[PDB]
mmCIF file of C-alpha atoms in Angstrom:
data_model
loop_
_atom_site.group_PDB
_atom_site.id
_atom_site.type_symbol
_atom_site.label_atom_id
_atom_site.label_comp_id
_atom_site.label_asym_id
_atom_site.label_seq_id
_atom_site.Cartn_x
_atom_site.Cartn_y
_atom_site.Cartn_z
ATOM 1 C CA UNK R 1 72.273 73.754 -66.843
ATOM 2 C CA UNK R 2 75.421 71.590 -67.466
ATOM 3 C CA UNK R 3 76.937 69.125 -69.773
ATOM 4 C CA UNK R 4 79.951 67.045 -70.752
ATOM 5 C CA UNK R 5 82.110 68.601 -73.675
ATOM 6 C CA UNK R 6 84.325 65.991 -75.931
ATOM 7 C CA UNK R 7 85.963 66.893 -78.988
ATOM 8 C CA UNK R 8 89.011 65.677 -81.320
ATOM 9 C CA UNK R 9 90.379 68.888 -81.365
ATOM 10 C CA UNK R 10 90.029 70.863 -78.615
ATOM 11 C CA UNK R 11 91.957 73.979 -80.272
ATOM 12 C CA UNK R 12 89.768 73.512 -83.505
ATOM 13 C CA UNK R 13 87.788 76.866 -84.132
ATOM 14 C CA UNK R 14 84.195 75.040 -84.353
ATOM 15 C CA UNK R 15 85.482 73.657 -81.225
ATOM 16 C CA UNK R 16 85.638 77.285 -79.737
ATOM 17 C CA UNK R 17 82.562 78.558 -81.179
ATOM 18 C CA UNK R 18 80.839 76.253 -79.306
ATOM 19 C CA UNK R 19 82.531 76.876 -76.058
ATOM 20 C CA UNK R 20 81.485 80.771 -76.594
ATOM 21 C CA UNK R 21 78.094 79.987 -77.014
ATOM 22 C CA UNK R 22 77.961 77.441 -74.042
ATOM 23 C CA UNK R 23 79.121 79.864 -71.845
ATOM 24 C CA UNK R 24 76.686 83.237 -73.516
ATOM 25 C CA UNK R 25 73.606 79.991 -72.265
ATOM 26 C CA UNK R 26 74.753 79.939 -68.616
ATOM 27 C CA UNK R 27 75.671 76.187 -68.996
ATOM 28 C CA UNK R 28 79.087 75.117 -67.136
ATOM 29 C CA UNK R 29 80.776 72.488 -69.013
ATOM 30 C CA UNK R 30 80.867 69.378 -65.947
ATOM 31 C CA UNK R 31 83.723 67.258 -65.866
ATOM 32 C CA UNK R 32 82.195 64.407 -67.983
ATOM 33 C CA UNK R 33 79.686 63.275 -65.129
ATOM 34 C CA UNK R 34 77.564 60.037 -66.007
ATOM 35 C CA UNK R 35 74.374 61.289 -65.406
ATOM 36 C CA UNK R 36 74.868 64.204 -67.410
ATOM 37 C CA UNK R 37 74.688 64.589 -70.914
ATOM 38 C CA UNK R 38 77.582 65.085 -73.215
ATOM 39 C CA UNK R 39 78.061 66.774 -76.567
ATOM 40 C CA UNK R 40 80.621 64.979 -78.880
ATOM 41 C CA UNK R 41 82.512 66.697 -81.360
ATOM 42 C CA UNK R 42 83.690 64.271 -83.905
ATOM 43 C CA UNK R 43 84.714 65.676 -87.004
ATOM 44 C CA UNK R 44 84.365 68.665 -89.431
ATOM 45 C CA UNK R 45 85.835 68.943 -92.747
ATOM 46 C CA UNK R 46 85.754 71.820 -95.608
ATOM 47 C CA UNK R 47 85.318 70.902 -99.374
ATOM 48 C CA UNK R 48 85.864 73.742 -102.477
ATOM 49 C CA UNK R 49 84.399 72.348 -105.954
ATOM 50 C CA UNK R 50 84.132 74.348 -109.120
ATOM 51 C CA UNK R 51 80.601 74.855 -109.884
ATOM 52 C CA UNK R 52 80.606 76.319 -113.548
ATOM 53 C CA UNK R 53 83.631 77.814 -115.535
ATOM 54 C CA UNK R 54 83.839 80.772 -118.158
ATOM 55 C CA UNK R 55 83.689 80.831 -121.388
ATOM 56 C CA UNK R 56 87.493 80.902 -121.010
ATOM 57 C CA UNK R 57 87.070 77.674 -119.330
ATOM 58 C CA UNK R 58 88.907 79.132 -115.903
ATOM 59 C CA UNK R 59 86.144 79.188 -112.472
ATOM 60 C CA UNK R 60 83.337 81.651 -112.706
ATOM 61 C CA UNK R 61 81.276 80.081 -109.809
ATOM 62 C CA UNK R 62 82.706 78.100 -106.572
ATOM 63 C CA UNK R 63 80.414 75.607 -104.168
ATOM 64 C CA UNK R 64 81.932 75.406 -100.704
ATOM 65 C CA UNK R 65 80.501 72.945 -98.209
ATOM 66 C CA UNK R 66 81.157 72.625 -94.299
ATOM 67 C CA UNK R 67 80.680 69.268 -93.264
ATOM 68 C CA UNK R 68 80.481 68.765 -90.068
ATOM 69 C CA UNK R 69 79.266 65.708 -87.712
ATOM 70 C CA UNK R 70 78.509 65.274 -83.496
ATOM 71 C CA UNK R 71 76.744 63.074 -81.009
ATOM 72 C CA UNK R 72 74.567 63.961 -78.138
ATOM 73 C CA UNK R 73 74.179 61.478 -75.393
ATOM 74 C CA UNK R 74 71.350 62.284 -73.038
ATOM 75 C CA UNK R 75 71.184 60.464 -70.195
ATOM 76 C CA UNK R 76 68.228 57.772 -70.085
ATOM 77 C CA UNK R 77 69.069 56.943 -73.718
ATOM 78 C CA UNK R 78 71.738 55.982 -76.265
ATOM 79 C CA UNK R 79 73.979 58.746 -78.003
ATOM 80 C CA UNK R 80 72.907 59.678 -81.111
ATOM 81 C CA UNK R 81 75.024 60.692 -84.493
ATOM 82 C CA UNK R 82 74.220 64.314 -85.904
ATOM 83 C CA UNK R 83 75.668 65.657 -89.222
ATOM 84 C CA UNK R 84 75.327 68.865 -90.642
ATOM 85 C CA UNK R 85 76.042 69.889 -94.188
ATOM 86 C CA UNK R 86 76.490 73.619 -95.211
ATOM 87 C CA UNK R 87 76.548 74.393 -99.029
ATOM 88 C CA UNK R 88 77.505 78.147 -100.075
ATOM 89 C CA UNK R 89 77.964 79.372 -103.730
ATOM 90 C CA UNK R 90 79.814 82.286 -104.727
ATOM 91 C CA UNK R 91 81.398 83.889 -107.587
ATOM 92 C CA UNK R 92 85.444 84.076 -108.198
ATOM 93 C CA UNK R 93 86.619 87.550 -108.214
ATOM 94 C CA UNK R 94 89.447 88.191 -111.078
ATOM 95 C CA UNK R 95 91.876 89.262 -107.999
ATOM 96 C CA UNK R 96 94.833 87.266 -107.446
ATOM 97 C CA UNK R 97 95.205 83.544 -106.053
ATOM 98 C CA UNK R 98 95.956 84.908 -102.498
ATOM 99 C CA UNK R 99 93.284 87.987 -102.424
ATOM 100 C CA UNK R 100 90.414 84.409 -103.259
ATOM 101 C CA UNK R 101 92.184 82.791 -100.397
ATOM 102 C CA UNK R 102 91.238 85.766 -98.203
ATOM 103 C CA UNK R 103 87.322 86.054 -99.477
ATOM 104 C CA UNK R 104 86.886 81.759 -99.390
ATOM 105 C CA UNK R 105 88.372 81.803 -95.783
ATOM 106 C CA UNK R 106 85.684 84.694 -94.706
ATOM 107 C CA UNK R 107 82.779 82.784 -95.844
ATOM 108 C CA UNK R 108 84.244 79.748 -94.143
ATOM 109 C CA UNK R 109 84.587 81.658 -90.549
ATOM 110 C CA UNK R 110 80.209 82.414 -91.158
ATOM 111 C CA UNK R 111 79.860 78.366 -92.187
ATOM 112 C CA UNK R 112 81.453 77.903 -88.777
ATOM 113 C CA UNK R 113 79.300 80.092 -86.900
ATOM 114 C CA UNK R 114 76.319 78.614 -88.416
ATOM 115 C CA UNK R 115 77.310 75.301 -87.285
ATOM 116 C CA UNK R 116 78.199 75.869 -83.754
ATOM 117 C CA UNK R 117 74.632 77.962 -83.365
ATOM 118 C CA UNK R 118 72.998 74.770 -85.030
ATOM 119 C CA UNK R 119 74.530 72.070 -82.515
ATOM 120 C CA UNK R 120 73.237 73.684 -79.809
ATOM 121 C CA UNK R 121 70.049 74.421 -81.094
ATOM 122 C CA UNK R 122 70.067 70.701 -82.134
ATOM 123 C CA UNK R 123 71.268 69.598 -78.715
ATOM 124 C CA UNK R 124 68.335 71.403 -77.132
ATOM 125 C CA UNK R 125 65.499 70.131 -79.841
ATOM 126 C CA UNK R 126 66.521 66.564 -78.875
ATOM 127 C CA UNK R 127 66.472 67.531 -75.381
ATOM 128 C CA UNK R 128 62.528 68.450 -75.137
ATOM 129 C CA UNK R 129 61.615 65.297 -76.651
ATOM 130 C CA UNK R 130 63.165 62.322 -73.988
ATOM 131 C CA UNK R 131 60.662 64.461 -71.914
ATOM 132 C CA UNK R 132 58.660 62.131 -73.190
ATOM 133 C CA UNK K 1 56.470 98.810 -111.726
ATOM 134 C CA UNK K 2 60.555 98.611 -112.047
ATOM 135 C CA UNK K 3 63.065 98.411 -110.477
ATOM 136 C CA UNK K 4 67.210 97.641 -110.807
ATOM 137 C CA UNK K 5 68.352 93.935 -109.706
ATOM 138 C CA UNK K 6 71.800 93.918 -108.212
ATOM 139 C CA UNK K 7 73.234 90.315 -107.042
ATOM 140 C CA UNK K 8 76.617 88.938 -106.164
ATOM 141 C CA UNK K 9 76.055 85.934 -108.196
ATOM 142 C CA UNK K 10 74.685 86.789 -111.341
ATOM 143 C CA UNK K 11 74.674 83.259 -112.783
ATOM 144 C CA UNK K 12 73.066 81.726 -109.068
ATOM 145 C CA UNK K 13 70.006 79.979 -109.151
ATOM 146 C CA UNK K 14 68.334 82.250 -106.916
ATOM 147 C CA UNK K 15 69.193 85.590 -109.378
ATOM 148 C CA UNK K 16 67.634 83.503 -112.576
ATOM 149 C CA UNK K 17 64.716 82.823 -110.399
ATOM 150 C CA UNK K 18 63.969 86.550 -108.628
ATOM 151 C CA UNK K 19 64.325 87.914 -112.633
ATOM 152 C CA UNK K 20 61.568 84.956 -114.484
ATOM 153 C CA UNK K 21 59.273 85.689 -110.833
ATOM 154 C CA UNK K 22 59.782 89.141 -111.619
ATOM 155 C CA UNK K 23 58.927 89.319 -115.473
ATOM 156 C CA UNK K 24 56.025 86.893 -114.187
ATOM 157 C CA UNK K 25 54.778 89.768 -111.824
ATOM 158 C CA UNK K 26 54.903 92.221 -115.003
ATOM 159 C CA UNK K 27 58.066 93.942 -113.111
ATOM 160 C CA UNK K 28 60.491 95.897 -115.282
ATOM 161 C CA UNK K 29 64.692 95.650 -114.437
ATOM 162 C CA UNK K 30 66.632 98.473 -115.561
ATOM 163 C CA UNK K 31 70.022 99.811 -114.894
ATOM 164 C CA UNK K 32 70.818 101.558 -111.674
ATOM 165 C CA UNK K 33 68.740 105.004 -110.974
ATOM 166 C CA UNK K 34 68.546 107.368 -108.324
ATOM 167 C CA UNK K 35 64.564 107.288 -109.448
ATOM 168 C CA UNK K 36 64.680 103.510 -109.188
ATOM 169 C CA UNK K 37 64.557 101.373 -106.383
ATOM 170 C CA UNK K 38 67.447 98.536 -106.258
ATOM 171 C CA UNK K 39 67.393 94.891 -105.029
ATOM 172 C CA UNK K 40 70.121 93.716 -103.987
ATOM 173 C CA UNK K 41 70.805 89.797 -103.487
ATOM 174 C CA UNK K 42 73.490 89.468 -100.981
ATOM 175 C CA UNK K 43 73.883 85.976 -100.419
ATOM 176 C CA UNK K 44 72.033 82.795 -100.083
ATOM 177 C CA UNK K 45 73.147 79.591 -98.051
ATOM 178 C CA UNK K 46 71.688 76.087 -97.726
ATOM 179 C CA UNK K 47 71.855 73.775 -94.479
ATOM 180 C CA UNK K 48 70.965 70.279 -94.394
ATOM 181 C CA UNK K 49 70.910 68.206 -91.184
ATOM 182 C CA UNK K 50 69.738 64.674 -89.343
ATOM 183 C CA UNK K 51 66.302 65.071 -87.882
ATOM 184 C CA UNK K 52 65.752 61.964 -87.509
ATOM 185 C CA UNK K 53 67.086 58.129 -87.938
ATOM 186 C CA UNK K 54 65.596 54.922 -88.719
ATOM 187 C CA UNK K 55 65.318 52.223 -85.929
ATOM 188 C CA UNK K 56 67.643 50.564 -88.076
ATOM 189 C CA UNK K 57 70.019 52.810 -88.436
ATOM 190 C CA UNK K 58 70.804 55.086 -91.706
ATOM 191 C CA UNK K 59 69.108 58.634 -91.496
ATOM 192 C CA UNK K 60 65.354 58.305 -91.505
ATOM 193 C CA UNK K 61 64.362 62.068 -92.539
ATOM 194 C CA UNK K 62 66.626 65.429 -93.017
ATOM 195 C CA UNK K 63 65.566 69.030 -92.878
ATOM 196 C CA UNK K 64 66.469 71.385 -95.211
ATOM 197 C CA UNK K 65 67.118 75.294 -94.549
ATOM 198 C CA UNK K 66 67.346 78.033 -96.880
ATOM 199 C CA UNK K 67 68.964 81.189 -96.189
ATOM 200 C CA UNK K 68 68.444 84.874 -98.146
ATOM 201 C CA UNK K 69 69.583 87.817 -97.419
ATOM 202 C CA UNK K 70 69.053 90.772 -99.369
ATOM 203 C CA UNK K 71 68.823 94.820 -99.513
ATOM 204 C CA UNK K 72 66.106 96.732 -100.686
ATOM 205 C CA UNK K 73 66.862 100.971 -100.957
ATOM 206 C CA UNK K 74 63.390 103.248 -101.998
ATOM 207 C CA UNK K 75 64.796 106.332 -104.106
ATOM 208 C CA UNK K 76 65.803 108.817 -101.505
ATOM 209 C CA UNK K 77 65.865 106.874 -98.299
ATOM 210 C CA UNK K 78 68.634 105.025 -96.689
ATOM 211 C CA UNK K 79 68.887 101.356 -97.795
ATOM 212 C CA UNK K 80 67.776 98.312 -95.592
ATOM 213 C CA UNK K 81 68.877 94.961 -95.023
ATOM 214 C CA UNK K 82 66.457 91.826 -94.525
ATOM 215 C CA UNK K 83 66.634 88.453 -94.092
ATOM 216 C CA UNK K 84 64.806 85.520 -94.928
ATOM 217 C CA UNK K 85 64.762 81.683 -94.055
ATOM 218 C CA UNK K 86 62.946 78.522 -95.665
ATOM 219 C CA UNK K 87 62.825 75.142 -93.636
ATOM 220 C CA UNK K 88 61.485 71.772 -95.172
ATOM 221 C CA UNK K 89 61.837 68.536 -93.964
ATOM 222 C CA UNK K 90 62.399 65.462 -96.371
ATOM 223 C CA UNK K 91 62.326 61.739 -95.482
ATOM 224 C CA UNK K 92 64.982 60.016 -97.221
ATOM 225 C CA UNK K 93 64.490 56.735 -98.978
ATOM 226 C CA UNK K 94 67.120 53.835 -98.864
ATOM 227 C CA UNK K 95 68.036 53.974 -102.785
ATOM 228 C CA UNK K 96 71.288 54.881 -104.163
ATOM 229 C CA UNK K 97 73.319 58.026 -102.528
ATOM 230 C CA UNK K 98 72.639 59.129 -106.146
ATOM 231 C CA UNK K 99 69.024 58.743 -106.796
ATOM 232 C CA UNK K 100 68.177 60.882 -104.042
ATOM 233 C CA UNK K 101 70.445 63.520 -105.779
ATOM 234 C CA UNK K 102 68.285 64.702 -108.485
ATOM 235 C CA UNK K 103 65.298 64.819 -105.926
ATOM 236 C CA UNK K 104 66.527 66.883 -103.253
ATOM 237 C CA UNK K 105 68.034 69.459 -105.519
ATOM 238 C CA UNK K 106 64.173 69.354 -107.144
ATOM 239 C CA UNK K 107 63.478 69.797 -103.480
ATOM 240 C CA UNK K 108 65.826 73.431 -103.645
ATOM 241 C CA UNK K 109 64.534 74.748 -106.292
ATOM 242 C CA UNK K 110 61.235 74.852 -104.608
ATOM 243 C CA UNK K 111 62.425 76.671 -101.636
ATOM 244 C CA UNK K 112 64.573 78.973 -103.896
ATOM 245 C CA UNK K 113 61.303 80.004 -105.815
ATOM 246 C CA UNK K 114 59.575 80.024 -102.274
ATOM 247 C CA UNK K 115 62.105 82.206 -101.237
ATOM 248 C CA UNK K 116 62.224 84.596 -104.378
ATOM 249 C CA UNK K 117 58.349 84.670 -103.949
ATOM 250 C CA UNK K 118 59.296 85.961 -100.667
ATOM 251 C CA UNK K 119 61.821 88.466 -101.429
ATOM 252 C CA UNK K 120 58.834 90.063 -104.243
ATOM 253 C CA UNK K 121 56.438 90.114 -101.584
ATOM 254 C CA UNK K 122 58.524 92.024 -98.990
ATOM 255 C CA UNK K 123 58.741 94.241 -101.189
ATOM 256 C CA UNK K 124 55.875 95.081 -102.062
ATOM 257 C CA UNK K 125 55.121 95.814 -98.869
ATOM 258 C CA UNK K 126 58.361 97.768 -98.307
ATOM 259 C CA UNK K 127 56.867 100.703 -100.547
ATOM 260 C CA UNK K 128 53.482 100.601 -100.069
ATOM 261 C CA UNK K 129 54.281 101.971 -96.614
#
């Protein structure tokens, strides 16, 4: 079918994931028609803590977590606010500060993927329900 | 019955959980073997999301999805991935943003054993065939 795309960063790579994935569905992105419904990307943020340390008393485990938040807006009822929270452990290799800045960013790129595959599949659960 | 248990977080819940499910199943881990078959715990992600919100207005109930994947490689044959998911779905109560804490992590733990119960299971299977 067809929808309305928003977002408040159009170059952002969640922002592109989605796009991808709009386009593998056969659904052509309408220029923000009212009686169609829109998907609203509003925000998505990436947070590192330290999740248990070493004897030494330097990181042994990391906890990253993808937040991310939307709104769909069917039409025939009132947009609604969707957030999504990713959490991922993983252990710090001894390499140096740039080769953990090359594993963290990896796992962040398969966060991303899981998000944009969860919007839609969100978008599409809320969908077959105001069939009702 | 043994086996050798290879994980990329040694110190994750998940690991700790596969190994006490494992004594519990009277299942042996040794050291890597070409006569022993190896599990290997690749990685293991949790999603949380809005399901559904109250008429009023915070977030009515969340569901909660558990991700495993893992390798398991029979002496002499090739090794094989698989993959395994847990979904739950919690309501959420309007205490403290802090209360709820030490609940829904209760609420992991759970799917983490559900899912090491799981990863036992489809294994068992794997070499009975």
């Amino acid at each position: 079918n067809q929808l309305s795309l928003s977002s408040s960063d159009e170059y952002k790579e969640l922002t592109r994931l989605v796009r991808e994935r709009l386009r593998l569905n056969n659904v052509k992105i309408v220029d923000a028609a009212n009686d169609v419904p829109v998907l609203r990307l509003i925000t998505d943020s990436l947070e590192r803590s330290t999740l248990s340390l070493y004897p030494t008393g330097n990181v042994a485990e990391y906890e990253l977590i993808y937040f991310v938040e939307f709104a769909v807006a069917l039409p025939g009822k009132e947009a609604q606010p969707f957030k999504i929270e990713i959490r991922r452990d993983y252990l710090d290799d001894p390499r140096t500060a740039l080769a953990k800045s090359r594993e963290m960013e990896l796992l962040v790129k398969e966060m991303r993927i899981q998000a944009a595959d969860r919007i839609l599949q969100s978008m599409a659960s809320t969908e077959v329900n105001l069939e009702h």
